Amino acid sequence: EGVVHGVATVA
């Protein structure tokens, strides 16, 4: 299937 978004934050 389609796009999978990650969750972006400050490391």
Place this chain on the structure above:
Amino acid sequence: GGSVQAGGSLRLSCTISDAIFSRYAVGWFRQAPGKECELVSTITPDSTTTHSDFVKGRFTLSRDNAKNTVYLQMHSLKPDDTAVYYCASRWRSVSEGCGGQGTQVTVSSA
């Protein structure tokens, strides 16, 4: 999100579906205010990393050794790096890469 003065550094983290992390390239994308989404860099499960032309060695990618996280290490940040940064896999276009939960990066002049 992270905010720095020009010349600074910032490390971002992207946690993404484990099934995806194990099998697919993960892309970092960014979108500056009033501008379109653009692809920044990618990393594969074997830690092959690609970069767009505007990176010029300043941003590097790595995968965590234990968890489903990819890191974007940024150095020598400039005000024009101010943007919301995002990560995604299996995108059908670059526009899709900025559709998820992003983090605001702000780089202020000195």
